[PDB]
Assembly symmetry: D2
Homo-oligomer: 261 residues x 4
């Protein structure tokens, strides 16, 4: 089986990578970073995001797995002391897989650009104010005036979505959640305020009102897009597959990351 | 087909009820409040809650429908001017049905009591403080100290769940959402703070820490339960069936109820 | 100088009290609980609240001081190991005093009752819903429909006021803060939502709309008042005087109580 | 008495300006934009901010007044129909003045820059993450990791400060309020979360942790500052003086702007 390993780049993560490579060398496993089948991230959830985004074209062929060299992450949720136990059961195979839904983000121009997000996708204003019309299934819902909006995946609800008052939902719920950023609500302007959770096949469209330029963000990426006609949010048809070798529940992961561990 | 009609009790709702009854009299429809098949609520969502709770034993045999004599409700979402058009297509039949998930609430004693909620179920403290341990799938999640907790259905997220900062989710998502009420978070006490959305078959259990008495609430009902051993929350296996005769989306209903109409 | 000591009642707080009494016995200090001049609370902020409320008629004659036998409190903010150092400088005198503003709460009937609050005063509903009209300086401000309201002192902003999203203000600011409890905001009902901070001489009046019965709360007290005509909130003309023997800033106290210590 | 008038620039605001100028021409009033004594803003609160900032060197010599050609503003709080009545009582004089506190913002480099804010001052991150240490009266309070912070004046609490969950305080309270922007709070990172209200002479200092570049904002201004050593917040010694010719309470202004009018 083909495999590759991504490291954060510091001292402990590079040394743990060369130890797993030497450990994989004692099995029929080829190190291939072009067309792998198991992608291992050593470092943190940020190191996991980069590993996901550089192989997002082969998502239905990869089983991801995360190793945190620092504090517990939600994707890098396996301690470095479990690496030598990890390489064996990965080499034998016969493991199980769990899948998390993804978020498709479409941007139209006066061309079209499609992105895939594991955590969330963000839209801010480029300098001046931020005003957009929110369309839900071709039905105008609200005129949002604030700092920006955030559409997050279920697994991304623990990330920047949480800091915006959003709710935490289990990654088995194939849905997406929209949150607001310092919305202006007065006697003339009105926003819903509450976060919105949309099921599959529900299309949330953002449409400009004046400025056609927005700082559009996808996970770690953040690019200023010019002359935007509409931004289209919906649950992606593609999923990310995790290699399941143990029982680490999602509410378990939330407990250790925010309550204490 | 058997039918019955519930009225709020005021002047306009009782007169609209006797007009539909006389309208149903021109078809093969029997007024039966014991074992109906179509239950019509005239008044508001509160009038709808009472109609749902007095027929919750026959939920898989009833198709509900709501008529609001006041402002737009989320279950009573049909104007009184559409009553004479409503009685016809209900009498002919051949309509469609939509189903919303429900919330089962189990209470154990040192006996057992099971309830069904359309909006939300609430747990408060009886006089003194409120302290409970939160268990998610037999895993202790947090020690909550505050005013209380609220577990709401998807359709109930627009109700009291919204006032507690909770998120609004589409009623097609078979799930439940837990929110907090003025939780105490200091350097020693710690709550998650964010709302939690649980999928089906996920059991959220509340367990006492000192006082075994709590003001347990289910929709409009609110009863003080004594010597409670645990409170068990989970998505109910039963659904509520609505008679669908027109296209009134859920995000449509949210727009007219909180943005403007 | 006359003095008295209040204890929480457990083992360590009663033993620390008898040690200070024996320590005070080596000076010209009389133990007098009728007309004291120094009131010492051993236990926590709750033990401090009881000591304040049983001597609220002599507030301009008492210098309070708090000793926490448990975690750091905001009024009981002196460790038990500093008791033997505390009794000396209190016996000699020549210390300094700091004063915190208080909250006067007036309730009218169809009689009148006036209370004094150190933390906050709370108004809830007795069974049914909670609807009141909010009057600010004889000007109607809003029709509040929710669970209740909370008017807190500056020193009380770290208490239940904090759990309701309210702001923390330094106790030198002679003011009061109003917060909301799960307010209903739709297309017809509208509340301000944000907390409100009122200066001195500003009178906030609550007026019923249907039910004239409310669960009125003052610090630990919580009494159901019948046939209430209006509730009147304003900054009290009386202050609580603390015995200052060391430098423990307020933002210091907030840091150790919510960040870490 | 010397005077000048600022207009938003559109059709109705320029025509109302030339009518007041012709109205002032019937009195002993000289139009002087260099060293005025009465500054009139025609348009909105944004038009008022520009008028305040271009005369902030002569704040103790100017009495400001605002005329809103659109919806009710908090500084432009006088309808255009009251202009001809406004010019007379301003020409006669013998009016009264009210003063609102201001916010001094100091920025040090490895030089120094001092700004004055009428609404709020904002600190964001330049590209990457935002991490600062919060110092209150030379005491480290917290390590803030989020989108940014906002320190607002009392009159500015109704502006961007309100959108961040902050409290609304009366402009007679000489203080300042700090709010957070999507703070990250986990098991290792910890922020206070609640807004903080600081009295006069209280110095809140922000200190970098990695990036020394921040998008610093003062009212409408927003400038990227390089190699910042610390940002210093405190209540300014200077006040802004309003020309009081009528009774328009602050809670009055809040009611008409957020409840309804
Ligand atoms: N879903 C997430 N939950 C919690 N923390 C997250 C998440 N995504 C990212 Br990126 N982080 C921070 C990465 C840690 C530094 Br390598
Ligand atoms: N899910 C709900 N969304 C909105 N309003 C609601 C809901 N449930 C109830 Br009860 N109300 C108030 C009933 C109106 C007075 Br008849
Ligand atoms: N202002 C307050 N800040 C923080 N905690 C408080 C406050 N008032 C009270 Br009561 N508590 C709890 C008392 C501890 C158990 Br003896
Ligand atoms: N303190 C403030 N309260 C409310 N609205 C405000 C405030 N400051 C400004 Br700028 N705006 C918007 C200006 C309107 C467009 Br000319």
């Amino acid at each position: 089986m083909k495999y590759m390993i991504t490291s954060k780049g510091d001292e402990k993560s590079d040394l743990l990578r060369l130890n797993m490579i030497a450990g994989f060398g004692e099995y029929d496993m080829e190190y291939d970073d072009v067309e792998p089948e198991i992608v291992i991230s050593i470092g943190g959830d940020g190191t996991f995001l980069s590993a996901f985004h550089q192989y997002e074209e082969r998502l239905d062929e990869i089983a991801f797995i995360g190793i945190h060299t620092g504090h517990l992450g939600f994707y890098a949720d396996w301690r470095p002391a479990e690496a030598d136990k990890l390489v064996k059961l990965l080499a034998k195979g016969e493991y199980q897989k769990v899948s998390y839904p993804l978020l498709k983000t479409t941007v139209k121009y006066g061309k079209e650009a499609t992105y895939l997000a594991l955590n969330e996708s963000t839209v801010k204003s480029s300098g001046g104010p931020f005003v957009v019309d929110v369309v839900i299934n071709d039905i105008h819902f609200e005129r949002f005036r604030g700092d920006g909006l955030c559409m997050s995946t279920p697994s991304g609800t623990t990330a920047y979505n949480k800091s915006l008052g959003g709710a935490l939902m289990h990654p088995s719920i194939e849905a997406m959640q929209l949150t607001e950023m310092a919305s202006i609500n007065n006697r003339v302007y009105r926003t819903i305020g509450s976060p919105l959770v949309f099921p599959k096949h529900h299309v949330v469209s953002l449409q400009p009102v004046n400025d056609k330029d927005f700082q559009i963000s996808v996970d770690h990426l953040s690019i200023l897009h010019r002359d935007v006609q509409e931004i289209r949010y919906e649950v992606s048809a593609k999923k990310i597959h995790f290699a399941r070798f143990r029982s680490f529940p999602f509410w378990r992961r939330v407990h250790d990351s925010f309550i204490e561990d």
